[PDB]
Amino acid sequence: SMYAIRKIQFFYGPTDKKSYVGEEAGGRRELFKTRAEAQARIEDLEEGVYYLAHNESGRPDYKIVWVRGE
Amino acid sequence: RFILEISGDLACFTRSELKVERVSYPVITPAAARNILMAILWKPAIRWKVLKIEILKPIQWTNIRRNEVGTKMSERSGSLYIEDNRQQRASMLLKDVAYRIHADFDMTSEAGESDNYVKFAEMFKRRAKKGQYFHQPYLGCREFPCDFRLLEKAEDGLPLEDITQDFGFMLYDMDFSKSDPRDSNNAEPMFYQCKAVNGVITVPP
């Protein structure tokens, strides 16, 4: 259906929270038809240096997911 | 009557419907002025009454957050260990406020022996001049101390007479009646602020 990415973020202190990708801006969460686009998207996020926020434990984990077509 | 002016850097008077995360009023609270007067001189026989309130400088916001605990302490407990309780809280603080007040007072039922109107008025003037009180009046919270100068009329920056916006219905006070000594339980009288041009006028019942 609609392929996309699940986003998880681990903070120091056992807590941690979840949100998709594409919730940054006016555009809603972004939708890819093919898993290949999602794989490339994962790669290009993994490419760069990662700048930690405050009270952040380690580099985030992305996993791939297809969401039922909205 | 009496005319007084209050000054200070910071002040919040939290609405009810947002008490969880502070959203202060634009204007001062008619209930608050009562207690501010009572701070200088509390007797068990005096009933205060506020008549006129005057803004002085344009309203101005800032925002802040700090770490809180939300568990009222109880006898059965030993301590709190706040690390297991913290609830970060935000606040909408007014900045750089000075207000002017016209107010008077009357007598309660328990007039007592020394129920002389004149002596209470005189000692109030004395305490206002020398700087005397049970405790420094707040400005809606203990951390914002205020400063009060007893003046006659027009002894500060010219009042900001500019017509300002409405505010709908506003907190007035909290009834003491159905409560015995030490305010067992209370209700909440309201009023209508109705955007006074510059001088907000407190109507009695």
Partner: protein
């Protein structure tokens, strides 16, 4: 038991490090948005006091009732016992689950936000580390690249205003020796607080105004105005305590209010 109103002014400075990072915008030192100077909320000072007392005395009459795990691990009768047991609870007060009127128990001492004399500027160091946090993806292929952004300030100064109110001390029994303890505390409140984030924070000067009667004689505004602190004219960039000037006026206060120089 105390019987006179008290006021005081407190002067303290941060050498290098962050006093109170905002928990809303990353961790930057709090700064007043439209002027460039940096606040320090009172509650931080109150916490440092409570920690000092818990660390120093360690016996009865001097428990704190608001602890931090790191350091260590009819109604009127109970209320009086309790307000006799914990130094903190009788000093700054507390609010009971139930009591005379919603549990309000105030206590004498009060404090206030402590601004800075001059506008202040911040530095954002970028910081790294050896090992990856978790084996998740393990960052094995040299991907441990991560940055930390630790904050700092170069130097400043801070003014704090504090009150007392003896009437509350009546119903809390604030003995004058407790007040002496309080003075000693704020004098030495900093040597027992060192953490990487804050860096070296230091206490400069304490000035105590004492009245004669219970209700006071002179409105405290002038009492504060007597002390003045100014930037030295020559320098345009402040870097130490040497760049400031402190002036005390004891020409008129001697009527019925005494002044001390406990701080220095």
């Amino acid at each position: 038991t105390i019987e006179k109103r008290y006021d005081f002014v407190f002067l303290f400075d941060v050498q290098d490090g962050n006093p109170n990072g905002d928990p809303d915008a990353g961790n930057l030192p709090r700064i007043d948005p439209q002027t460039g100077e940096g606040l320090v909320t009172d509650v931080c000072l109150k916490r440092k006091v409570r920690n000092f007392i818990q660390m120093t005395q360690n016996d009865e009459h001097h428990d704190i009732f608001i602890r931090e795990k790191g350091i260590l691990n009819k109604t009127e009768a109970a209320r009086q016992y309790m307000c006799s047991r914990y130094y903190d609870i009788r000093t700054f007060g507390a609010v009971m689950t139930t009591g005379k009127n919603a549990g309000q128990v105030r206590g004498p001492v009060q404090l206030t936000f402590s601004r800075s004399i001059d506008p202040i500027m911040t530095l954002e160091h970028s910081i790294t580390r050896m090992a990856v946090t978790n084996e998740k993806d393990a960052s094995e292929t040299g991907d441990n690249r991560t940055m930390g952004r630790k904050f700092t300030v170069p130097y400043g100064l801070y003014r704090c205003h504090g009150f007392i109110s003896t009437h509350f001390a009546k119903q809390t029994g604030f003995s004058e020796n407790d007040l002496e303890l309080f003075w000693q505390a704020l004098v030495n409140m900093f040597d027992h607080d060192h953490s990487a984030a804050r860096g070296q924070m230091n206490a400069r000067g304490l000035y105590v105004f004492e009245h004669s009667n219970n209700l006071g004689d002179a409105p405290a505004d002038s009492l504060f105005k007597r002390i003045q602190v100014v930037k030295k004219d020559g320098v345009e960039v402040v870097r130490s305590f040497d760049d400031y000037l402190v002036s005390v006026d004891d020409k008129n206060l001697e009527e019925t209010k005494l002044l001390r120089k406990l701080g220095g």
